[PDB]
Every structure is written in structure tokens, then in C-alpha cells.
Symmetry: C3
Subunit: 142 residues, 3 copies
């Protein structure tokens, strides 16, 4: 399959697939500094058109916190198939847990593509008619 990728400019480091990475690393489009307990959108310098029927998902790398002291505020970013315009540049919403500096080109998160959920009919019901599972730790801890 093919992904069309448009880089923000010629100074962006090209992304690529590596042998031992099932997801593709994305890169900070510019230097970004963030103070402890502050938030910043980190631009990633790419816009894409994904294959027909696909969305993308973005998560941190396991070393992102170690190297950069940030967490991703939306947990996993969902890039909608429709986010494919010439100005629809991807971003990584970062919250800094310590003072930090991210440099241009640094690999701070990773993405993959996945088929979107199929079309679903939402059928309103008065009663579901199933037994309750419970949740929030119903199965205990041990």
C-alpha cells in the first residue's frame, strides 16, 4: 500500500521504516522547550494521505519519557482519514513532567495505520437483556 507524505519543508528529516520497528518513528519539526507542568503542541512536520479506508494512530516511544520527560495528553492520537489536506500537519500534544528540550529531528513518537471501524448502526434500546459484568477492578488484583 502507499502513503503520500508531504513534509513541512526541506529541513525536515525524512521518516522511515526500520527492521525492528513495527511502527514508524516521527520527528519534532523544530526545537521545542517545555517547562515542568506545562503543555506544548510539538509539530511533527508531516502531512499525509493514508490509503483509502485507513486511519493512523500515534503513541509515544517507550524512551520518550526517559529522554524527554513528556507524556502524550491524548494517550493515543487518532489521525482521521480526512486529515489529509495540505495544511493538516500532524502534532504530538506533550505535557512535560520535568523541564525539557526537544531538538528538531528527534524521534519522539511512533505511528501506524489501521483500517477504520466499519459503518455501524446505532440501535437505541430500552433494555439490553444481558447479565452485568461490572468493571473498574471487579476481577481484583491477585
Amino acid at each position: 500500500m502507499q502513503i503520500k507524505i508531504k513534509y513541512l519543508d526541506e529541513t525536515q528529516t525524512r521518516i522511515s521504516k526500520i527492521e525492528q520497528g513495527d511502527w514508524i518513528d516521527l520527528r519534532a519539526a523544530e526545537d521545542v522547550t517545555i517547562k515542568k507542568d506545562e503543555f506544548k503542541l510539538v509539530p511533527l512536520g508531516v502531512a499525509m494521505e493514508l490509503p483509502e479506508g485507513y486511519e493512523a494512530h500515534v503513541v509515544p516511544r517507550s524512551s520518550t519519557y526517559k529522554n524527554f520527560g513528556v507524556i502524550q495528553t491524548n494517550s493515543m492520537g487518532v489521525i482521521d482519514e480526512s486529515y489529509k489536506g495540505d495544511n493538516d500537519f500532524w502534532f504530538f500534544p506533550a505535557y512535560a513532567l520535568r523541564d525539557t528540550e526537544i531538538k528538531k529531528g528527534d524521534r519522539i513518537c511512533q505511528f501506524r495505520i489501521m483500517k477504520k471501524m466499519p459503518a455501524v448502526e446505532l440501535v437505541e434500546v430500552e433494555h439490553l437483556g444481558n447479565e452485568d459484568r461490572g468493571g473498574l477492578g471487579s476481577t481484583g488484583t491477585k
Copy 2:
């Protein structure tokens, strides 16, 4: 495919598929106020029965931190297929990074369905017999 949806009551705003959203927005079932550095379960006012063989995933919207100053503590909630009883109402576990107010009907997260992983046999081995990949930033940062 079909999802059966049972709303908590008649005051819940109905959820909807929108053209440019690959996931479907869910809504606070009531006003919720949360103090900085505190946790609150935000009820979403919906119980669902998903198509056979499917689970659901729930994440924040990208704008949830911006609009509401919260993160989702479990990162991506997994709605088990068995969570389909009449009292199995979905929730969003929120941790506030600043003082916040969420109003009834506010779209604070989003969901999609996905096929559950297949049945797997767990086969205990003494040795895997593969080369080590390493992890936690083994590929570096540049």
C-alpha cells in the same frame, strides 16, 4: 453492523457519527468538577452491546486537555465485549492537571469498535531461541 445502545436516561444527549470523525464522540452524563491533581470517574451515560466478537476502545479527544485539563489514567480504555449488562455504564477515568469543570453533554472522549484478538494458546517454553532486540530507546533518538 449494529450496536445496541442504552442511555442512562432521557436527559443524555444522543451520540452521533460525524463525517470527518473516524471514531465516535462520547459525552459527560452529568456536570463534573475536578480539582487540580485529583481523580474522578466521569460517567458517559451509555451502556452498549457490541457486535459479536467485538470490543471497544476509548481515548481522549486531542482537545480534551486543552478544553478540560484532564488526562485519561488508563490511557486507552478497553471495553470488554462482556460489558453489556443493563448497569454496565461506560466511564472515563479522569485525572485533572488543573482545576476543571466538565458540563453535561460535553464531548470529552471518543470510541471505536474492533475485533477482539483471536483465541491463543499460551505455550510455556524454557528458551525462545531468538536474538535479542533490546528495547527502551535501543534505536537511539536522532
Copy 3:
């Protein structure tokens, strides 16, 4: 299909599929103690070879915050198919929002497998030529 599992030693509690769990619970391989706003890797005490062409995803349980006071810094861990060496042991990267103790064998997170994304060709383009969707809350909140 099959997952080969190798435990850190013969005192790790073996992991198991339960009926009402679509994802499989994984356990702390030793007692771990964490202080508030500090970070620690929790070793999960397993190394796996997954079926051919599959990756794994690890996320917290909904009750992990309630039960243990931690968020997962990478949101959802991605376990690369190639992370299947004899020393490639899974971990859960915990950040403590409160002081906390986790005990050997506690179910702190959960995992499932998934098919890796297909091979994709990254095609460099100058213009995508689609209408802009916009993002970061372009659809509002009400």
C-alpha cells in the same frame, strides 16, 4: 494460534485468559515501591514470541490508578514482533501520581496481540491536493 511464553523464573505467577477479559492481565515480577512524581520500570517477568506477523499492545487496567497510583508513561506500549529474545523481558513504565507499592504477582496491566500494519511505500509529494480538515477541536465541544 500460539504465543510462546518464557517466564523470568519459576516463581512468576503464570498469566491467564479469563472469560470476561478480552485482553490478558500481566503481573509485577517483583515488589516495586514508587514515590510520588517519581518513575520506575515495573518488570513484568515474561518474554514472548508472538505468532508470525503479530505485534502486542499493553495498556493499564482501568483499576490500575485506583489500585496502584500509577499512569503508564508511553500510554500504550507497543511490543515489536522482533522483541522475542531470551532477554527481551516486558516492562510497564510507571509514573507515580501518589506514593505507592506494587507487589509481586499483582495484575497491573493488560495486553493483546494484533496484526502489524502492512508494508507501506512512503511516497513523497509536494501537494496532497485535498481539502483541509483541521484538528485540535475543530468540531467543538457541545
